[PDB]
mmCIF file of all heavy atoms in Angstrom:
data_model
loop_
_atom_site.group_PDB
_atom_site.id
_atom_site.type_symbol
_atom_site.label_atom_id
_atom_site.label_comp_id
_atom_site.label_asym_id
_atom_site.label_seq_id
_atom_site.Cartn_x
_atom_site.Cartn_y
_atom_site.Cartn_z
ATOM 1 N N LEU A 209 -12.396 36.757 8.756
ATOM 2 C CA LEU A 209 -11.715 35.696 9.566
ATOM 3 C C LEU A 209 -10.464 36.283 10.083
ATOM 4 O O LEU A 209 -9.535 36.498 9.339
ATOM 5 C CB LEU A 209 -11.493 34.473 8.728
ATOM 6 C CG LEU A 209 -10.655 33.314 9.288
ATOM 7 C CD1 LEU A 209 -10.525 33.367 10.793
ATOM 8 C CD2 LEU A 209 -11.321 32.014 8.883
ATOM 9 N N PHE A 210 -10.435 36.516 11.415
ATOM 10 C CA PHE A 210 -9.235 37.082 12.003
ATOM 11 C C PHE A 210 -8.359 35.970 12.606
ATOM 12 O O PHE A 210 -8.842 35.068 13.252
ATOM 13 C CB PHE A 210 -9.597 38.081 13.087
ATOM 14 C CG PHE A 210 -9.871 39.473 12.541
ATOM 15 C CD1 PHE A 210 -11.101 39.801 11.975
ATOM 16 C CD2 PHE A 210 -8.927 40.480 12.619
ATOM 17 C CE1 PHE A 210 -11.359 41.058 11.456
ATOM 18 C CE2 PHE A 210 -9.125 41.748 12.130
ATOM 19 C CZ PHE A 210 -10.334 42.039 11.535
ATOM 20 N N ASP A 211 -7.051 36.092 12.383
ATOM 21 C CA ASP A 211 -6.093 35.179 12.892
ATOM 22 C C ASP A 211 -5.344 36.057 13.902
ATOM 23 O O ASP A 211 -4.646 37.009 13.512
ATOM 24 C CB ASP A 211 -5.138 34.701 11.800
ATOM 25 C CG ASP A 211 -4.083 33.756 12.314
ATOM 26 O OD1 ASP A 211 -3.688 33.882 13.478
ATOM 27 O OD2 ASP A 211 -3.642 32.858 11.593
ATOM 28 N N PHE A 212 -5.507 35.717 15.172
ATOM 29 C CA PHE A 212 -4.928 36.462 16.248
ATOM 30 C C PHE A 212 -3.878 35.689 17.066
ATOM 31 O O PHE A 212 -4.290 35.073 18.067
ATOM 32 C CB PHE A 212 -5.972 36.995 17.239
ATOM 33 C CG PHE A 212 -5.992 38.446 17.447
ATOM 34 C CD1 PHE A 212 -7.129 39.138 17.109
ATOM 35 C CD2 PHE A 212 -4.965 39.085 18.016
ATOM 36 C CE1 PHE A 212 -7.162 40.544 17.338
ATOM 37 C CE2 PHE A 212 -4.936 40.458 18.215
ATOM 38 C CZ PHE A 212 -6.059 41.200 17.893
ATOM 39 N N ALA A 213 -2.630 35.711 16.614
ATOM 40 C CA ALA A 213 -1.597 34.900 17.329
ATOM 41 C C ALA A 213 -0.638 35.717 18.142
ATOM 42 O O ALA A 213 0.110 35.140 18.954
ATOM 43 C CB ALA A 213 -0.859 34.044 16.276
ATOM 44 N N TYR A 214 -0.592 37.029 17.937
ATOM 45 C CA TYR A 214 0.331 37.876 18.672
ATOM 46 C C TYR A 214 -0.307 39.010 19.433
ATOM 47 O O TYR A 214 0.323 40.137 19.507
ATOM 48 C CB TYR A 214 1.343 38.446 17.684
ATOM 49 C CG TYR A 214 2.185 37.403 16.955
ATOM 50 C CD1 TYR A 214 1.785 36.956 15.723
ATOM 51 C CD2 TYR A 214 3.332 36.830 17.589
ATOM 52 C CE1 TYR A 214 2.590 35.984 15.069
ATOM 53 C CE2 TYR A 214 4.091 35.828 16.937
ATOM 54 C CZ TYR A 214 3.687 35.411 15.634
ATOM 55 O OH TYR A 214 4.386 34.491 15.045
ATOM 56 N N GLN A 215 -1.455 38.817 19.979
ATOM 57 C CA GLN A 215 -2.127 39.849 20.754
ATOM 58 C C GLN A 215 -1.270 40.219 21.977
ATOM 59 O O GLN A 215 -0.956 39.327 22.774
ATOM 60 C CB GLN A 215 -3.543 39.384 21.212
ATOM 61 C CG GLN A 215 -4.264 40.469 22.036
ATOM 62 C CD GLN A 215 -5.601 40.022 22.442
ATOM 63 O OE1 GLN A 215 -6.388 40.900 22.982
ATOM 64 N NE2 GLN A 215 -5.960 38.782 22.320
ATOM 65 N N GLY A 216 -0.843 41.466 22.024
ATOM 66 C CA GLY A 216 -0.003 41.943 23.112
ATOM 67 C C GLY A 216 1.411 42.281 22.722
ATOM 68 O O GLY A 216 2.077 42.915 23.544
ATOM 69 N N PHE A 217 1.830 41.837 21.513
ATOM 70 C CA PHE A 217 3.193 42.161 21.116
ATOM 71 C C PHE A 217 3.395 43.416 20.267
ATOM 72 O O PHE A 217 4.505 43.769 20.045
ATOM 73 C CB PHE A 217 3.743 40.946 20.292
ATOM 74 C CG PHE A 217 4.106 39.772 21.132
ATOM 75 C CD1 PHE A 217 3.155 38.847 21.508
ATOM 76 C CD2 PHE A 217 5.416 39.640 21.598
ATOM 77 C CE1 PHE A 217 3.440 37.759 22.256
ATOM 78 C CE2 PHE A 217 5.749 38.526 22.417
ATOM 79 C CZ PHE A 217 4.753 37.596 22.743
ATOM 80 N N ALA A 218 2.340 44.052 19.882
ATOM 81 C CA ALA A 218 2.486 45.240 19.072
ATOM 82 C C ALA A 218 2.562 46.439 20.005
ATOM 83 O O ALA A 218 3.639 47.077 20.137
ATOM 84 C CB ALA A 218 1.349 45.418 18.092
ATOM 85 N N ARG A 219 1.381 46.775 20.647
ATOM 86 C CA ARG A 219 1.340 47.924 21.521
ATOM 87 C C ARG A 219 0.835 47.517 22.918
ATOM 88 O O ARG A 219 1.325 47.966 23.899
ATOM 89 C CB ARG A 219 0.444 49.009 20.932
ATOM 90 C CG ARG A 219 0.992 49.644 19.675
ATOM 91 C CD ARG A 219 -0.124 50.180 18.820
ATOM 92 N NE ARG A 219 -1.041 51.045 19.609
ATOM 93 C CZ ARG A 219 -2.291 51.286 19.330
ATOM 94 N NH1 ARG A 219 -2.837 50.729 18.224
ATOM 95 N NH2 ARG A 219 -3.020 52.078 20.131
ATOM 96 N N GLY A 220 -0.171 46.676 22.913
ATOM 97 C CA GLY A 220 -0.768 46.192 24.143
ATOM 98 C C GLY A 220 -2.002 45.356 23.902
ATOM 99 O O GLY A 220 -2.462 45.324 22.768
ATOM 100 N N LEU A 221 -2.468 44.675 24.948
ATOM 101 C CA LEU A 221 -3.634 43.771 24.798
ATOM 102 C C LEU A 221 -4.858 44.458 24.237
ATOM 103 O O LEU A 221 -5.388 43.992 23.169
ATOM 104 C CB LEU A 221 -3.962 43.160 26.185
ATOM 105 C CG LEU A 221 -2.924 42.189 26.760
ATOM 106 C CD1 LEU A 221 -3.287 41.830 28.202
ATOM 107 C CD2 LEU A 221 -2.857 40.939 25.921
ATOM 108 N N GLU A 222 -5.346 45.490 24.813
ATOM 109 C CA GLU A 222 -6.510 46.199 24.399
ATOM 110 C C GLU A 222 -6.295 46.927 23.034
ATOM 111 O O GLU A 222 -7.203 46.958 22.213
ATOM 112 C CB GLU A 222 -6.987 47.183 25.443
ATOM 113 C CG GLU A 222 -7.454 46.544 26.761
ATOM 114 C CD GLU A 222 -8.621 45.579 26.546
ATOM 115 O OE1 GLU A 222 -9.752 46.068 26.200
ATOM 116 O OE2 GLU A 222 -8.466 44.365 26.762
ATOM 117 N N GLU A 223 -5.139 47.566 22.940
ATOM 118 C CA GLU A 223 -4.806 48.318 21.692
ATOM 119 C C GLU A 223 -4.746 47.409 20.469
ATOM 120 O O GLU A 223 -5.230 47.737 19.416
ATOM 121 C CB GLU A 223 -3.451 48.987 21.883
ATOM 122 C CG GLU A 223 -3.396 50.021 22.997
ATOM 123 C CD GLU A 223 -2.982 49.411 24.366
ATOM 124 O OE1 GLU A 223 -3.727 48.526 24.827
ATOM 125 O OE2 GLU A 223 -1.936 49.852 24.912
ATOM 126 N N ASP A 224 -4.140 46.212 20.625
ATOM 127 C CA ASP A 224 -3.972 45.314 19.530
ATOM 128 C C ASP A 224 -5.291 44.743 18.969
ATOM 129 O O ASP A 224 -5.330 44.114 17.908
ATOM 130 C CB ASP A 224 -3.069 44.130 19.883
ATOM 131 C CG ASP A 224 -1.658 44.614 20.182
ATOM 132 O OD1 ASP A 224 -1.407 45.775 20.099
ATOM 133 O OD2 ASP A 224 -0.804 43.733 20.459
#
Side-chain angles (χ1 to χ4, degrees):
Chain A
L209 173 15
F210 277 78
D211 178 329
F212 236 120
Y214 300 96
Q215 180 178 190
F217 286 84
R219 293 155 51 204
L221 292 170
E222 296 298 294
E223 299 87 300
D224 294 3

